[PDB]
Structure 1
């Protein structure tokens, strides 16, 4: 059972964060390991605050997993601080053989703060070229690039060094479905939907199990359509 190591925050209410990573990775067929980036204080309605994990304790968790478990993929969600973004980049550069799924979490779904967005956007520059796949929703895509046109923003992310981008949402969305577009090396590789879209951890698990990107993304949609 290949392992996905998740650099993710803890949401006590269990709606998001490393709990959702654990659930998705288990359903993908892989094993989840966790390097907790923050203990948040939040529920479905608001974020009250959070205590970011120090860079030292973050790397200590990650390094405890290294050597014990067969890490094949890293996934990141909430990182909280620019220190933790830098620590993850340091970790990834020490392990270029790991695949990496970057979910560029800038805000909570409730709207509450999971860190200062402007400085997080600037710090994410370092992680963009390291990712096997970046999974921005349309808000995250625009924030990372400073570009409001989705097509132009996607291309800008590739100019910034992205290798593959799964854009969640776009001009093809409807009340029943969010449309996802998988781009590889700047070119549209697969155009799909998703009934509703938190795909990064499930995709990471499928990548850990040896799937190609296209097959992993397809499995993730089948998983969500199976919930429906």
Structure 2
């Protein structure tokens, strides 16, 4: 088996996002995907009708079945659904500090439909921020996590909250053709790029395969520049 990325992600039946997108991205990165499903959502391209969040017990049962069997090198999270599941993931990560971890701070669906109570989820994410090898917020997620509207100030706030590295997707350098991404490591700009961007799972795959953070981010852009 290839190095494995274990994904704590929700299921989108329409196949536009969620663990399906994780599987597609990780396969294309060259790694193997394993899945601990956090929720069965009821949604399509237009709206979210609702979701059934996985219990913390069933979430950890899925994850722990993978541990010891597959060569897990990295964890990726997307939709977690509940504060219980955020806490369960933190528990899992603290039991395995040797795993890398890519935090994609999903708060809402592509359609804008609810994937949980944002106020309580934002507060719960505080626990996961310092555990991540990389956090990948878009500009909306960045502001929600920090309560700061200025992008520069919000980025610094994330580092004050314990972030190790942050890939901010979008911002003042965007155009009709590209979203500009900025990679910060320990509060400093490390790479400033673009992307013709769901990058978390691909990056996780490259990290599992032994890439440096900068090399993983670059590969993910190259992948999309061919996608």
State TM-score, norm by structure 1. Answer: 0.99
Q: List gaps (5 residues or longer) in structure 2.
A: none
Q: Provide Cα deviations, 1:156-195, integer angstroms capped at 9, x if missing partner.
A: 0000000000000010000000000000000000000000
CA distance in structure 1 between the aligned counterparts of 2:183 and 2:110, rounded to whole angstroms: 22
Q: Give the number of equivalent residue pairs.
A: 226
CA root-mean-square deviation: 0.2
CA distance in structure 1 between the aligned counterparts of 2:203 and 2:132, rounded to whole angstroms: 13
CA distance in structure 2 between the aligned counterparts of 1:57 and 1:12, rounded to whole angstroms: 20
1:136 lines up with 2:137 in the alignment: yes
Paired residue secondary structure (2:39): strand
Paired residue secondary structure (2:33): strand
How far residue 71 of structure 1 moved from its aligned partner, in angstroms, is 0.2
Paired residue secondary structure (1:226): coil
CA distance in structure 1 between the aligned counterparts of 2:186 and 2:124, rounded to whole angstroms: 22
Q: Provide Cα deviations, 1:57-84, integer angstroms capped at 9, x if missing partner.
A: 0000000000000000000000000000
How far residue 109 of structure 1 moved from its aligned partner, in angstroms, is 1.0
Q: Provide Cα deviations, 1:105-163, integer angstroms capped at 9, x if missing partner.
A: 00001000000000000000000000000000000000000000000000000000000
CA distance in structure 2 between the aligned counterparts of 1:37 and 1:180, rounded to whole angstroms: 28
Question: How do 1:72-151 and structure 2 match up within 5 A?
Answer: 72-151=73-152
1:18 lines up with 2:25 in the alignment: no
CA distance in structure 2 between the aligned counterparts of 1:198 and 1:73, rounded to whole angstroms: 17
CA distance in structure 2 between the aligned counterparts of 1:175 and 1:67, rounded to whole angstroms: 46
Q: List gaps (5 residues or longer) in structure 1.
A: none
How far residue 91 of structure 1 moved from its aligned partner, in angstroms, is 0.1
CA distance in structure 2 between the aligned counterparts of 1:193 and 1:206, rounded to whole angstroms: 18
Q: Provide Cα deviations, 1:84-104, integer angstroms capped at 9, x if missing partner.
A: 000000000000000000000
State TM-score, norm by structure 2. Answer: 0.99
How far residue 210 of structure 1 moved from its aligned partner, in angstroms, is 0.2
CA distance in structure 2 between the aligned counterparts of 1:224 and 1:118, rounded to whole angstroms: 33
How far residue 224 of structure 1 moved from its aligned partner, in angstroms, is 0.1
CA distance in structure 1 between the aligned counterparts of 2:49 and 2:97, rounded to whole angstroms: 36
